[PDB]
């Protein structure tokens, strides 16, 4: 036989039996990707950690010339060190701070934007797309007002995302296409003074303050293109798959509906489950170091298998199930960990919390309209994603 080979599996609804038999026999071991390349492949809790915090595991070189793949990239080679390259731009602070969700009436726009949405799929009838016409139109709408940019553009940019985000052995002309298409429309944003709020209201600002005269209208854009994308992907993804997991709960689905307050807490162990990143997380080892039974060597490949980390039942007990009144509940890595640690995280929380708030009101009662295993899981995509979610309420 061939040596193991990765991804297990893209169905987002289940985690493989042998996710649990590597984790007690061999937490790191090697693994093909797609590619040809071989990796190891994290998936206790205690290793993926180890990886994730130490930063001579790094995600930057895993854009090097020759290097061991996961998949090709879809991106310019420094985008892979985009957050360094904000970092020594001097612009931390400012993204972070457009990205909380705190701004004023940003929660209030996304209620509305998800009881809109809701209402007219009651108003069409049975069955509804929680997918296409729910999770992904309202992240879509979330990122736009996030961004500072006019919601009509939002569909256009968001048709990019189903090639941005494949996970492919060879480059994707499509890919570089829509970016330099995207960025074009970005660069135009910063030129736009309607675009006074958001994110880009705020980068156009800076890019004409003398503190930033040399930071380049490439990396301004750039900014745009990938806060849009990794936004939109991940939080449209990860709602989606948590409606799912959701559903498939109706005593959690009912508690919820009975005490809303819940919620913050339920959206936590929906993270700590859920199978939306299709493949590890990629770092590329700088130096020769120890990880469990293995030395892994400088320029070798480390994927984080985030589900490893989650489902370990050393870390959390009886993993599978979901439990609101966990002593740990934040420790789990949907978020990754360490330098890389998602920034993005609170309003990915609160686009998920608010969207169920909305779904349990509305439609109290919702269900699948067709058996689970009739979902279409897309496949080589760096999340897992049900191709439609259809229900009936
Ligand atoms: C529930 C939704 C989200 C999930 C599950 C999620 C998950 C993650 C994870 C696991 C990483 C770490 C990747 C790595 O270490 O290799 C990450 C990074 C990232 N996230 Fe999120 N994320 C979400 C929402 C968002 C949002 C709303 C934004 C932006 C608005 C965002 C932007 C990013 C960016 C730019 C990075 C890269 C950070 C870096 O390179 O250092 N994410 N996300
Ligand atoms: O910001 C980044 N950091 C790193 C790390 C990263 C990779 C993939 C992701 O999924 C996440 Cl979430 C993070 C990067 O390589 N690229 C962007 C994200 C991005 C990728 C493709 C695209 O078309 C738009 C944005």
């Not at 293995?294 to 298998?305: A, P, S």
Request: glycine share 8%.
């Amino acid at each position: 036989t061939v040596l193991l080979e990765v991804p297990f599996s893209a169905r987002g609804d289940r985690i493989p039996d042998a996710v649990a038999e590597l984790r007690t026999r061999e937490p790191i071991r090697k693994v093909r990707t797609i590619t040809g390349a071989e990796a190891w492949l994290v998936s206790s809790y205690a290793l993926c950690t180890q990886v994730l915090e130490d930063r001579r595991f790094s995600m930057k070189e895993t854009a090097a010339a020759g290097a061991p793949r996961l998949n090709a990239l879809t991106v310019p080679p420094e985008v892979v060190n985009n957050m360094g390259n904000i970092a020594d731009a001097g612009l931390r602070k400012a993204v972070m701070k457009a990205i909380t969700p705190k701004a004023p009436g940003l929660e209030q726009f996304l209620r509305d934007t998800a009881n809109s949405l809701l209402d007219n799929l009651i108003t069409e009838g049975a069955p509804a797309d929680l997918r296409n016409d729910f999770a992904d139109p309202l992240a879509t709408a979330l990122h736009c007002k996030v961004l500072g940019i006019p919601q009509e553009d939002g569909p256009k940019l968001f048709r990019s995302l189903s090639i941005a985000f494949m996970s492919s052995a060879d480059p994707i002309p499509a890919a570089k296409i829509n970016w330099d298409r995207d960025i074009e429309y970005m660069a135009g944003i910063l030129e736009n003074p309607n675009i006074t709020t958001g994110l880009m209201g705020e980068l156009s600002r800076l890019r004409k303050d003398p503190a930033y005269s040399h930071v380049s209208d490439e990396l301004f854009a750039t900014i745009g293109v990938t806060f849009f994308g990794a936004g939109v992907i991940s939080t449209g993804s990860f709602l989606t798959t948590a409606l799912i997991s959701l559903i498939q709960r109706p005593q959690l689905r009912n508690l919820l509906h009975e005490k809303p307050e819940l919620i913050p807490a339920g959206v936590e162990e929906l993270l700590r489950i859920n199978l939306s990143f299709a493949d590890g997380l990629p770092r590329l080892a700088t130096a020769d170091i120890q990880v469990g039974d293995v030395l892994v060597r400088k320029g070798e490949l480390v994927l984080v298998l985030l589900e490893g980390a989650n489902f370990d039942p050393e870390h959390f007990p009886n993993p599978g199930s979901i439990e609101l009144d966990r002593p740990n509940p934040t420790s789990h890595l949907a978020f990754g960990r360490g330098q890389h640690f998602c920034p993005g995280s609170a309003l990915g929380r609160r686009h998920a919390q608010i969207g169920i708030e909305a779904l349990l009101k509305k439609m109290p009662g919702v269900d699948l309209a067709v058996p689970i295993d009739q979902l279409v899981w897309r496949t080589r995509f760096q999340r897992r994603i049900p191709e439609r979610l259809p229900v009936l309420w």
